[PDB]
Amino acid sequence: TRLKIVTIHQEPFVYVKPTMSDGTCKEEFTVNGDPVKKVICTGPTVPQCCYGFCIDLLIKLARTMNFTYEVHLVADGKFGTQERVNNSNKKEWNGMMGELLSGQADMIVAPLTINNERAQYIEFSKPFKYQGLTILVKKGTRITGINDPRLRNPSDKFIYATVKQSSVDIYFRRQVELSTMYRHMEKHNYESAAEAIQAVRDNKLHAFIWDSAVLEFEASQKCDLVTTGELFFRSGFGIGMRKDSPWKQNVSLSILKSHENGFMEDLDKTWVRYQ
Amino acid sequence: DNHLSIVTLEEAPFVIVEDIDPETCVRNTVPCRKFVKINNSTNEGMNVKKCCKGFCIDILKKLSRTVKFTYDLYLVTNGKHGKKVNNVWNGMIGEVVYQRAVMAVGSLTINEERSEVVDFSVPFVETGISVMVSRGTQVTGLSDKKFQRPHDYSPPFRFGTVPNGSTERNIRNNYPYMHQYMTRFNQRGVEDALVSLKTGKLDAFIYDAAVLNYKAGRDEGCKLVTIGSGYIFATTGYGIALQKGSPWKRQIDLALLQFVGDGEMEELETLWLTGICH
Numbered sequence: 001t002r003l004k005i006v007t008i009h010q011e012p013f014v015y016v017k018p019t020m021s022d023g024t025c026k027e028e029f030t031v032n033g034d035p036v037k038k039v040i041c042t043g044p045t046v047p048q049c050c051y052g053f054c055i056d057l058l059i060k061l062a063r064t065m066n067f068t069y070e071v072h073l074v075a076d077g078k079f080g081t082q083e084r085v086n087n088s089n090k091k092e093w094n095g096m097m098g099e100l101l102s103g104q105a106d107m108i109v110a111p112l113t114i115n116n117e118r119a120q121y122i123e124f125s126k127p128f129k130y131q132g133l134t135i136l137v138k139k140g141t142r143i144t145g146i147n148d149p150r151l152r153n154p155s156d157k158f159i160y161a162t163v164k165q166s167s168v169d170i171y172f173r174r175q176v177e178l179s180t181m182y183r184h185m186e187k188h189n190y191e192s193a194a195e196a197i198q199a200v201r202d203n204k205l206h207a208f209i210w211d212s213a214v215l216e217f218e219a220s221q222k223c224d225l226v227t228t229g230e231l232f233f234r235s236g237f238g239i240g241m242r243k244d245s246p247w248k249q250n251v252s253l254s255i256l257k258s259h260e261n262g263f264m265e266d267l268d269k270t271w272v273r274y275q
Numbered sequence: 276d277n278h279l280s281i282v283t284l285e286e287a288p289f290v291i292v293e294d295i296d297p298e299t300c301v302r303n304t305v306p307c308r309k310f311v312k313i314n315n316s317t318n319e320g321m322n323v324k325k326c327c328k329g330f331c332i333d334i335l336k337k338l339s340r341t342v343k344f345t346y347d348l349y350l351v352t353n354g355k356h357g358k359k360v361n362n363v364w365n366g367m368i369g370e371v372v373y374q375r376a377v378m379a380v381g382s383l384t385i386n387e388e389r390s391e392v393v394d395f396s397v398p399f400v401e402t403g404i405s406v407m408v409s410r411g412t413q414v415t416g417l418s419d420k421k422f423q424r425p426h427d428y429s430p431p432f433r434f435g436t437v438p439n440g441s442t443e444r445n446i447r448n449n450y451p452y453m454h455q456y457m458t459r460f461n462q463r464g465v466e467d468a469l470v471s472l473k474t475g476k477l478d479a480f481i482y483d484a485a486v487l488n489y490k491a492g493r494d495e496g497c498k499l500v501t502i503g504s505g506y507i508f509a510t511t512g513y514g515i516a517l518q519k520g521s522p523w524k525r526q527i528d529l530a531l532l533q534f535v536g537d538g539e540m541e542e543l544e545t546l547w548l549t550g551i552c553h
């Protein structure tokens with residue numbers, strides 16, 4: 001009866017911080033005075049503190065639709081792609097997609113990209129956030145963007161990649177036109193966005209292709225990092241539910257109402273927009 | 276039955292309406308019928324054959340081929356996109372609600388009020404409430420304090436919208452003083468507002484993001500600019516409206532997401548929407 005919510009570590013949408021020895025969460029406010037609402041999350045066995053854009057949205061959806069929840073972090077740490085089961089013609093999803101389809105989760109509340117591949121199997125909400133794909137590099141690295149020669153004609157001297165088992169991994173694997181770029185990326189893809197972002201700072205990864213809502217926040221907080229400033233593909237984040245879930249209709253209505261409410265504008269100002 | 280009645284609405288470049296070639300519809304267009312009244316004191320009229328083309332018409336052609344359906348397209352004549360007058364819908368939404376059409380194709384914005392009475396596709400182009408200004412003017416978006424508290428600045432910003440639409444209703448609900456102030460700068464239409472901007476009679480024009488982006492892209496001299504997409508207020512999109520619980524929704528949704536993912540949607544935007552201005 002308590003909805004099992006799965007999510008993933010991805011600032012500024014989901015922060016994950018240790019709990020106090022009390023087992024409760026440090027009380028904070030934003031620099032503008034608004035309370036930072038925190039929920040207990042379980043993840044890799046240990047209770048932790050989770051907050052951010054999507055946590056604020058989850059609390060709004062729960063209060064609006066009058067349901068209770070318990071939040072856990074995805075066990076394998078991935079967003080979700082569909083893979084072949086070895087020695088089999090079966091296919092299965094990993095990441096949060098697999099947890100939602102198997103029943104370990106009743107709802108995905110995370111920056112989960114809406115695409116055709118996932119929409120075949122699950123139901124997406126109307127987008128709660130519109131954004132796209134961009135490229136993050138270290139300050140001093142100079143590329144024009146997705147069409148830079150060092151990306152269209154890759155080599156081991158300039159390493160670029162994305163996150164494994166993600167929507168970006170899907171997007172480059174499926175397009176005939178990205179066959180050369182995908183061959184380079186699949187040798188260097190990272191297990192999580194945080195590891196990839198740290199590799200860009202440490203000059204072990206030269207370009208990171210990822211979500212603009214995340215990369216632009218990272219550049220606004222870490223002066224050694226910059227983006228192309230260009231979106232080469234536009235996409236949206238949606239709440240993920242199983243087919244014919246009883247909450248599908250009202251979740252989408254609440255998201256549309258929240259956009260028109262200015263509530264999403266408040267979340268955007270609080271979590272997303274910076275200098 | 277996979278033959279569907281579909282309603283549309285003229286709004287370039289999304290739906291452009293032409294006459295028949297003096298007698299078929301020339302290529303790149305599809306037939307669309309329009310009920311034309313004899314006069315304003317009668318319901319009598321004549322069905323006239325027209326030809327329809329544009330961004331959303333190219334969407335409909337792709338959908339008809341992929342989802343495998345035929346259609347009779349007709350233009351709405353009572354209302355525009357969809358407005359609830361005394362709890363009775365007009366426009367394209369009314370055609371779907373009262374089951375004269377099973378599908379609405381056009382510059383139709385997805386919102387909460389309409390989604391309670393129709394089912395919406397996934398959005399196929401992003402839109403919302405945006406702001407257009409002359410190049411050099413500094414505003415952040417609808418939530419800018421220069422709009423919320425206009426008299427905190429001297430001289431106050433001169434800004435308005437086209438009333439009686441979705442934009443005015445949203446501002447009235449969200450920013451009551453901004454609505455009270457900006458009615459003095461009500462614009463009769465988009466073309467009127469563009470001229471007021473370019474002639475210095477208006478400082479900003481608040482309207483649909485998709486329309487403003489299209490207008491700024493083709494502005495002569497590229498003098499008119501819109502805010503960045505990250506500052507659009509109440510981000511939503513144009514979507515296909517279907518009857519509540521329609522069996523076509525799932526395959527229409529998967530078709531549109533396929534068009535977006537495989538570059539077909541970007542090609543239509545290049546063909547119809549992107550302009551020369553930066």
Ligand SMILES: CCCc1ccc(N2N[C@@H](C(=O)O)C[C@@H]2C[C@@H](N)C(=O)O)cc1
Nearest residue numbers: 356382383384386403440441442483509
């Ligand atoms: C839902 C909140 C976001 C939003 C998106 C677009 C608008 N625009 N304002 C309309 C107007 O004022 O004439 C025109 C257009 C809506 C139109 N496409 C329609 O379908 O009615 C307003 C709000």
